[PDB]
Amino acid sequence: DPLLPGFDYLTLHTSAARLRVAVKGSGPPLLLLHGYPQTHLAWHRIAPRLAEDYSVVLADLRGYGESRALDGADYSKAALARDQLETMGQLGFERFAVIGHDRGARVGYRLALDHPQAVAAFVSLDVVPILDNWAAVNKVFALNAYHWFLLAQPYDLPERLIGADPEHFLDYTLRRMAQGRDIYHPQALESYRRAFRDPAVRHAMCEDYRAAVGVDADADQADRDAGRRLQCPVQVLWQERPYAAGQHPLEIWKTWAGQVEGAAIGASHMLPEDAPDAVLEHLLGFLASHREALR
Amino acid sequence: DPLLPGFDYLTLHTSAARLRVAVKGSGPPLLLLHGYPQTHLAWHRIAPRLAEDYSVVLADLRGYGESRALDGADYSKAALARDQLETMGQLGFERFAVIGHDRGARVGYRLALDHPQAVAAFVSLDVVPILDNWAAVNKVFALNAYHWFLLAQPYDLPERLIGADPEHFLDYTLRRMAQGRDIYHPQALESYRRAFRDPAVRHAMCEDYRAAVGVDADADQADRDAGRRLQCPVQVLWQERPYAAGQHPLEIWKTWAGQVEGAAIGASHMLPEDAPDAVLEHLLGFLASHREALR
Ligand SMILES: [Cl-]
Ligand SMILES: [Cl-]
């Protein structure tokens, strides 16, 4: 079975970036945003079904995959959110739904906060806002997510370390994120590997993690200060695991948005690849139930 | 001016290790234990003065410098504490004072807890027990001390990363720990570098950080559970910086010991090399004031 049958591969030229996009379908627009250390191919088990009923846009985040900044570039979520407005606008959409996984969900919620008239509906796949993540840091968090702290160290420490044997570190990371499950299509994996072998991609990824510590967290705090919330329907699909008090993802998203629903999914953090049929059932139901929002 | 004038370099053969020791002087015994990523040479600005009045023993911790386990070796603080009892015993001392810096202080307090009749007095240079460190973890801690989380990742992840360009990572680490101050004698630095270029040393260091997460923290908790405290006079000399509530080093040590004193030292964490004359004044006064304890 082919990867992304019928998707058309584009390169969009925006103000600050050259962005890889893959498109298919007609109907209401959906923008799907992958995470780390991946590319748009992470959507290969979900996007074709969606494209039966919707206009589907898959993008490589700035610096990831085949997308690149034109320069000391800005790799903050706010910058990558602007890339999405420009990308969708070029394609003919002023308003659209956003489905994000991992770093993509972080771009997505920032986009929804800053541009509430553009974002029709928002789905987070196993992500809460960075503000909430930082408040939860303890010994166990920092051991589990050691890379959040390594990749945020000043330039060029982590670039040196991860750049020595890049494919080894990429593969290790993917296995660890999948909890050892065999979820990576071997051809998707060669695309992930090729990107991670590019020093510019590894640098962009460190810059993402640096932004998460700094400007991205400042942005989230300023919204919390203002009482600024996502204005669209929100769905969160989370990994089935125990959540400490105040850390349940549904509870968290209800502090950020007035219209929130969600479900636990039995799988790893890698929801697009690990649990595509469970994700699809939820996504399709959510999009159907909020068809007015999409208008 | 020479490094360690008059010190005699020994190799002791213990049950589980081949240990590098350097000795000088006569009188009451002091055992000085360096930290990461260093060797016994870190004491070169302090040990000669002490050796005017005391029997001074400098050791490389198991796996560090020129010290090595005979094998899946145990690199827990309890194991390294046993090395110190055996080392001092061989040299002719059943009871002795311990002065530790960084990982050395961790070996030292474990030794004092487990073997209260052996440890006459204990000095910690800018260290509190690991139990207290773990309780303090938050976003800022994990960013500052990112390596505590990296080097504790399962074998052989951090060995791969730090082993790629070892001398670069060693030098970077030393500069960062010194807060950019020019405190490393160029010949001491070649000894630190040579050790870090040895894959067995890098592995031993990761094993130390793994133990800190696991068995070392379990040991400290069991003592806290039992209400077991250091029985000797304790001195703590700490870096002058702000301490959050419950995190002041004097306050912390008073929860672990009935007889505690200390002082703030204007310098980096690298007290032996950065502030030797301030450290000496305090050490000498402490040892003089507790001359009965040493008997
Ligand atoms: Cl994430
Ligand atoms: Cl330490």
Tab-separated table of N, CA and C in Angstrom, chain A residues 55-170:
chain	number	residue	atom	x	y	z
A	55	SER	N	-10.454	18.960	2.328
A	55	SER	CA	-9.218	19.447	1.770
A	55	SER	C	-8.113	19.283	2.777
A	56	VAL	N	-7.161	18.448	2.487
A	56	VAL	CA	-6.087	18.127	3.462
A	56	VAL	C	-4.763	18.747	3.008
A	57	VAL	N	-4.158	19.479	3.943
A	57	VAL	CA	-2.867	20.115	3.773
A	57	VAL	C	-1.907	19.575	4.843
A	58	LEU	N	-0.824	18.928	4.396
A	58	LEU	CA	0.248	18.424	5.265
A	58	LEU	C	1.452	19.312	5.068
A	59	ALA	N	2.033	19.813	6.150
A	59	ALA	CA	3.216	20.681	6.006
A	59	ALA	C	4.368	20.161	6.839
A	60	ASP	N	5.576	20.392	6.352
A	60	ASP	CA	6.800	20.215	7.165
A	60	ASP	C	6.932	21.545	7.927
A	61	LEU	N	7.090	21.457	9.236
A	61	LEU	CA	7.355	22.668	10.060
A	61	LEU	C	8.675	23.309	9.653
A	62	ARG	N	8.771	24.624	9.799
A	62	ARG	CA	9.952	25.359	9.430
A	62	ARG	C	11.174	24.719	10.073
A	63	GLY	N	12.153	24.389	9.241
A	63	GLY	CA	13.409	23.722	9.695
A	63	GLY	C	13.396	22.223	9.727
A	64	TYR	N	12.207	21.635	9.797
A	64	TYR	CA	12.037	20.193	9.786
A	64	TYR	C	11.868	19.698	8.359
A	65	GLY	N	12.178	18.436	8.130
A	65	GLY	CA	11.967	17.801	6.837
A	65	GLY	C	12.618	18.599	5.732
A	66	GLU	N	11.792	18.989	4.750
A	66	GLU	CA	12.219	19.794	3.615
A	66	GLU	C	11.913	21.267	3.685
A	67	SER	N	11.388	21.714	4.818
A	67	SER	CA	11.084	23.125	5.034
A	67	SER	C	12.271	23.841	5.637
A	68	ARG	N	12.490	25.074	5.208
A	68	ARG	CA	13.675	25.779	5.684
A	68	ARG	C	13.407	27.251	5.809
A	69	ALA	N	14.026	27.865	6.811
A	69	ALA	CA	14.012	29.284	6.935
A	69	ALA	C	14.898	29.839	5.808
A	70	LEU	N	14.568	31.015	5.311
A	70	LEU	CA	15.453	31.701	4.319
A	70	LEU	C	16.797	32.177	4.944
A	71	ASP	N	16.796	32.399	6.263
A	71	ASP	CA	18.004	32.589	7.102
A	71	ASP	C	18.089	31.515	8.208
A	72	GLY	N	20.159	33.102	11.516
A	72	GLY	CA	19.553	33.641	12.714
A	72	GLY	C	18.023	33.657	12.657
A	73	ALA	N	17.429	32.655	12.006
A	73	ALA	CA	16.002	32.656	11.828
A	73	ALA	C	15.246	32.472	13.157
A	74	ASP	N	13.997	32.909	13.153
A	74	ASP	CA	13.052	32.743	14.260
A	74	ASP	C	12.376	31.366	14.142
A	75	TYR	N	12.562	30.521	15.142
A	75	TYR	CA	11.920	29.180	15.161
A	75	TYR	C	10.938	29.060	16.342
A	76	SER	N	10.415	30.210	16.799
A	76	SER	CA	9.383	30.215	17.826
A	76	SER	C	8.053	29.701	17.273
A	77	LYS	N	7.175	29.193	18.135
A	77	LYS	CA	5.861	28.771	17.679
A	77	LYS	C	5.085	29.892	16.988
A	78	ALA	N	5.252	31.143	17.424
A	78	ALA	CA	4.553	32.286	16.843
A	78	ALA	C	4.983	32.423	15.376
A	79	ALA	N	6.294	32.268	15.100
A	79	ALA	CA	6.834	32.364	13.713
A	79	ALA	C	6.289	31.256	12.841
A	80	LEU	N	6.265	30.035	13.388
A	80	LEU	CA	5.783	28.890	12.651
A	80	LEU	C	4.259	28.986	12.464
A	81	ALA	N	3.577	29.603	13.418
A	81	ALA	CA	2.140	29.898	13.257
A	81	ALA	C	1.880	30.856	12.081
A	82	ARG	N	2.659	31.911	11.991
A	82	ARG	CA	2.606	32.808	10.804
A	82	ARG	C	2.846	32.063	9.501
A	83	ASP	N	3.783	31.112	9.492
A	83	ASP	CA	4.005	30.260	8.282
A	83	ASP	C	2.711	29.552	7.849
A	84	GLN	N	1.943	29.084	8.833
A	84	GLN	CA	0.705	28.350	8.557
A	84	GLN	C	-0.374	29.282	7.992
A	85	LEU	N	-0.485	30.493	8.528
A	85	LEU	CA	-1.450	31.443	7.973
A	85	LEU	C	-1.100	31.755	6.541
A	86	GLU	N	0.184	31.960	6.279
A	86	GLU	CA	0.620	32.276	4.911
A	86	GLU	C	0.436	31.096	3.950
A	87	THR	N	0.777	29.912	4.419
A	87	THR	CA	0.636	28.677	3.649
A	87	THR	C	-0.852	28.485	3.263
A	88	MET	N	-1.736	28.475	4.251
A	88	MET	CA	-3.128	28.270	3.961
A	88	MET	C	-3.723	29.374	3.103
A	89	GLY	N	-3.355	30.593	3.390
A	89	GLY	CA	-3.778	31.736	2.569
A	89	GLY	C	-3.384	31.574	1.111
A	90	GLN	N	-2.119	31.186	0.866
A	90	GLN	CA	-1.676	30.958	-0.518
A	90	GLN	C	-2.541	29.916	-1.232
A	91	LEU	N	-2.852	28.849	-0.515
A	91	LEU	CA	-3.651	27.739	-1.012
A	91	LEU	C	-5.130	28.072	-1.218
A	92	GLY	N	-5.563	29.209	-0.686
A	92	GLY	CA	-6.915	29.707	-0.870
A	92	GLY	C	-7.804	29.668	0.358
A	93	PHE	N	-7.233	29.500	1.544
A	93	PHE	CA	-8.022	29.380	2.784
A	93	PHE	C	-7.635	30.440	3.817
A	94	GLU	N	-8.625	31.258	4.185
A	94	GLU	CA	-8.489	32.238	5.274
A	94	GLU	C	-8.850	31.678	6.648
A	95	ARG	N	-9.584	30.550	6.647
A	95	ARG	CA	-10.064	29.895	7.866
A	95	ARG	C	-10.018	28.391	7.622
A	96	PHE	N	-9.597	27.663	8.651
A	96	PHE	CA	-9.307	26.241	8.518
A	96	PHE	C	-9.171	25.584	9.868
A	97	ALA	N	-9.368	24.262	9.875
A	97	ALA	CA	-9.175	23.476	11.111
A	97	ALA	C	-7.686	23.049	11.131
A	98	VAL	N	-7.173	22.852	12.350
A	98	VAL	CA	-5.800	22.487	12.619
A	98	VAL	C	-5.799	21.229	13.472
A	99	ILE	N	-5.003	20.248	13.041
A	99	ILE	CA	-4.792	18.987	13.757
A	99	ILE	C	-3.287	18.863	13.920
A	100	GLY	N	-2.837	18.885	15.179
A	100	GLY	CA	-1.399	18.879	15.464
A	100	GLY	C	-0.998	17.692	16.335
A	101	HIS	N	0.218	17.229	16.177
A	101	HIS	CA	0.802	16.185	17.024
A	101	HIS	C	2.132	16.697	17.521
A	102	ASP	N	2.413	16.562	18.816
A	102	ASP	CA	3.735	16.872	19.356
A	102	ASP	C	4.072	18.334	19.020
A	103	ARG	N	5.242	18.671	18.442
A	103	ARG	CA	5.515	20.094	18.225
A	103	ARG	C	4.465	20.799	17.364
A	104	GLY	N	3.860	20.057	16.426
A	104	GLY	CA	2.813	20.580	15.582
A	104	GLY	C	1.597	21.086	16.328
A	105	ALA	N	1.242	20.429	17.437
A	105	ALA	CA	0.146	20.862	18.244
A	105	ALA	C	0.482	22.168	18.935
A	106	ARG	N	1.793	22.347	19.225
A	106	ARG	CA	2.282	23.594	19.879
A	106	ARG	C	2.190	24.802	18.921
A	107	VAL	N	2.548	24.548	17.657
A	107	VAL	CA	2.344	25.544	16.624
A	107	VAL	C	0.849	25.832	16.518
A	108	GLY	N	0.058	24.776	16.508
A	108	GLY	CA	-1.369	24.918	16.329
A	108	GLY	C	-2.079	25.740	17.367
A	109	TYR	N	-1.813	25.500	18.649
A	109	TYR	CA	-2.526	26.241	19.688
A	109	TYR	C	-2.063	27.671	19.732
A	110	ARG	N	-0.814	27.932	19.419
A	110	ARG	CA	-0.329	29.309	19.319
A	110	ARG	C	-1.024	30.045	18.184
A	111	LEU	N	-1.147	29.383	17.049
A	111	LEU	CA	-1.872	29.938	15.910
A	111	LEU	C	-3.328	30.263	16.311
A	112	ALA	N	-3.986	29.332	17.014
A	112	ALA	CA	-5.396	29.550	17.403
A	112	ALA	C	-5.556	30.707	18.384
A	113	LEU	N	-4.640	30.807	19.344
A	113	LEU	CA	-4.654	31.937	20.306
A	113	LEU	C	-4.472	33.286	19.654
A	114	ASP	N	-3.507	33.366	18.751
A	114	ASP	CA	-3.111	34.647	18.103
A	114	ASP	C	-4.068	35.051	16.984
A	115	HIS	N	-4.704	34.065	16.361
A	115	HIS	CA	-5.534	34.285	15.202
A	115	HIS	C	-6.846	33.552	15.277
A	116	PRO	N	-7.693	33.950	16.219
A	116	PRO	CA	-8.901	33.205	16.465
A	116	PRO	C	-9.870	33.199	15.272
A	117	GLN	N	-9.829	34.201	14.380
A	117	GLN	CA	-10.762	34.155	13.257
A	117	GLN	C	-10.281	33.159	12.170
A	118	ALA	N	-9.005	32.754	12.197
A	118	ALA	CA	-8.487	31.835	11.218
A	118	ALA	C	-8.696	30.351	11.569
A	119	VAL	N	-8.809	30.025	12.857
A	119	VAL	CA	-8.796	28.642	13.252
A	119	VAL	C	-10.225	28.178	13.627
A	120	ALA	N	-10.820	27.375	12.740
A	120	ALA	CA	-12.188	26.882	12.843
A	120	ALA	C	-12.390	25.893	13.943
A	121	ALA	N	-11.361	25.055	14.171
A	121	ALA	CA	-11.389	23.966	15.157
A	121	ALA	C	-9.957	23.509	15.327
A	122	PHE	N	-9.661	22.952	16.495
A	122	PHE	CA	-8.285	22.562	16.860
A	122	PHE	C	-8.268	21.228	17.554
A	123	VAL	N	-7.416	20.343	17.092
A	123	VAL	CA	-7.205	19.023	17.695
A	123	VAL	C	-5.736	18.891	18.112
A	124	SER	N	-5.551	18.606	19.399
A	124	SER	CA	-4.211	18.287	19.934
A	124	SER	C	-4.075	16.770	20.132
A	125	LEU	N	-3.038	16.155	19.532
A	125	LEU	CA	-2.729	14.773	19.749
A	125	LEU	C	-1.586	14.661	20.757
A	126	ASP	N	-2.018	14.395	21.995
A	126	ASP	CA	-1.158	14.170	23.168
A	126	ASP	C	-0.202	15.284	23.558
A	127	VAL	N	-0.727	16.523	23.497
A	127	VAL	CA	-0.018	17.711	23.876
A	127	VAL	C	-0.847	18.656	24.686
A	128	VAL	N	-0.242	19.211	25.748
A	128	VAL	CA	-0.777	20.353	26.464
A	128	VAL	C	0.156	21.548	26.300
A	129	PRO	N	-0.339	22.771	26.642
A	129	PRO	CA	0.538	23.908	26.460
A	129	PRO	C	1.836	23.844	27.280
A	130	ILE	N	2.874	24.406	26.699
A	130	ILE	CA	4.202	24.412	27.318
A	130	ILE	C	4.190	25.002	28.718
A	131	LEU	N	3.362	26.039	28.925
A	131	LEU	CA	3.246	26.587	30.279
A	131	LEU	C	2.923	25.521	31.318
A	132	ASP	N	1.951	24.688	30.998
A	132	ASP	CA	1.539	23.561	31.858
A	132	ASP	C	2.668	22.531	32.000
A	133	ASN	N	3.364	22.200	30.919
A	133	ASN	CA	4.521	21.259	30.983
A	133	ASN	C	5.604	21.756	31.940
A	134	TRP	N	5.968	23.051	31.838
A	134	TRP	CA	7.034	23.523	32.681
A	134	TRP	C	6.652	23.476	34.150
A	135	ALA	N	5.386	23.749	34.461
A	135	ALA	CA	4.950	23.726	35.846
A	135	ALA	C	5.015	22.331	36.466
A	136	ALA	N	5.016	21.321	35.615
A	136	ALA	CA	4.980	19.899	36.018
A	136	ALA	C	6.375	19.296	36.192
A	137	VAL	N	7.408	20.065	35.907
A	137	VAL	CA	8.782	19.485	35.956
A	137	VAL	C	9.132	19.004	37.351
A	138	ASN	N	9.622	17.766	37.443
A	138	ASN	CA	10.153	17.178	38.636
A	138	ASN	C	11.203	16.156	38.142
A	139	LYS	N	11.805	15.420	39.077
A	139	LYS	CA	12.860	14.446	38.771
A	139	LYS	C	12.436	13.483	37.664
A	140	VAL	N	11.261	12.859	37.809
A	140	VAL	CA	10.788	11.885	36.817
A	140	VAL	C	10.537	12.497	35.455
A	141	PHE	N	10.010	13.729	35.404
A	141	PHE	CA	9.732	14.371	34.139
A	141	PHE	C	11.059	14.579	33.426
A	142	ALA	N	12.045	15.092	34.172
A	142	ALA	CA	13.308	15.537	33.555
A	142	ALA	C	14.115	14.321	33.073
A	143	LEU	N	13.979	13.200	33.761
A	143	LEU	CA	14.597	11.930	33.280
A	143	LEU	C	13.911	11.408	32.005
A	144	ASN	N	12.569	11.416	32.002
A	144	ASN	CA	11.782	10.921	30.860
A	144	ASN	C	12.065	11.798	29.634
A	145	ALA	N	11.931	13.109	29.827
A	145	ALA	CA	12.092	14.090	28.791
A	145	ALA	C	13.436	14.818	28.848
A	146	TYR	N	14.512	14.061	29.010
A	146	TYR	CA	15.850	14.644	29.190
A	146	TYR	C	16.191	15.519	28.011
A	147	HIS	N	15.672	15.169	26.824
A	147	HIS	CA	16.032	15.933	25.658
A	147	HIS	C	15.459	17.327	25.613
A	148	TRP	N	14.383	17.563	26.315
A	148	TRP	CA	13.836	18.904	26.438
A	148	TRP	C	14.829	19.851	27.047
A	149	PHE	N	15.678	19.325	27.951
A	149	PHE	CA	16.719	20.084	28.607
A	149	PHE	C	18.031	20.083	27.864
A	150	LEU	N	18.377	18.961	27.241
A	150	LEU	CA	19.591	18.923	26.415
A	150	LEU	C	19.477	19.851	25.180
A	151	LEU	N	18.364	19.744	24.430
A	151	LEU	CA	18.275	20.413	23.123
A	151	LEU	C	18.076	21.926	23.310
A	152	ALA	N	17.744	22.349	24.533
A	152	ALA	CA	17.559	23.763	24.876
A	152	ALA	C	18.850	24.445	25.414
A	153	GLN	N	19.958	23.698	25.522
A	153	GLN	CA	21.189	24.247	26.005
A	153	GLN	C	21.684	25.233	24.934
A	154	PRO	N	22.530	26.193	25.331
A	154	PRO	CA	22.979	27.202	24.371
A	154	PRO	C	23.708	26.638	23.142
A	155	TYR	N	23.508	27.339	22.019
A	155	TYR	CA	24.173	27.004	20.788
A	155	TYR	C	25.685	26.976	21.043
A	156	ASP	N	26.427	25.943	20.640
A	156	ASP	CA	26.048	24.800	19.781
A	156	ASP	C	26.243	23.482	20.496
A	157	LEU	N	26.040	23.494	21.818
A	157	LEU	CA	26.222	22.266	22.577
A	157	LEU	C	25.422	21.054	22.094
A	158	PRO	N	24.065	21.176	22.047
A	158	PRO	CA	23.349	19.982	21.639
A	158	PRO	C	23.563	19.636	20.146
A	159	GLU	N	23.817	20.628	19.315
A	159	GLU	CA	24.094	20.362	17.917
A	159	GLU	C	25.347	19.491	17.783
A	160	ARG	N	26.363	19.771	18.615
A	160	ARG	CA	27.527	18.947	18.631
A	160	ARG	C	27.285	17.516	19.022
A	161	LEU	N	26.497	17.321	20.087
A	161	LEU	CA	26.248	16.020	20.611
A	161	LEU	C	25.377	15.169	19.695
A	162	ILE	N	24.260	15.707	19.227
A	162	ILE	CA	23.327	14.936	18.389
A	162	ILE	C	23.821	14.777	16.940
A	163	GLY	N	24.753	15.626	16.554
A	163	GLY	CA	25.286	15.639	15.191
A	163	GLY	C	26.419	14.672	14.926
A	164	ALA	N	26.926	14.046	15.978
A	164	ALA	CA	28.068	13.143	15.850
A	164	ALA	C	27.730	11.876	15.062
A	165	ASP	N	26.623	11.234	15.445
A	165	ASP	CA	26.110	10.026	14.785
A	165	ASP	C	24.628	10.243	14.657
A	166	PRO	N	24.237	11.057	13.703
A	166	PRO	CA	22.832	11.499	13.696
A	166	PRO	C	21.799	10.409	13.517
A	167	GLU	N	22.038	9.488	12.575
A	167	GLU	CA	21.052	8.464	12.331
A	167	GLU	C	20.875	7.549	13.555
A	168	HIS	N	21.961	7.265	14.279
A	168	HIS	CA	21.814	6.493	15.497
A	168	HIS	C	20.922	7.174	16.537
A	169	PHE	N	21.118	8.482	16.729
A	169	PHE	CA	20.365	9.205	17.749
A	169	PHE	C	18.874	9.302	17.297
A	170	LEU	N	18.667	9.497	15.984
A	170	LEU	CA	17.317	9.610	15.419
A	170	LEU	C	16.588	8.286	15.692
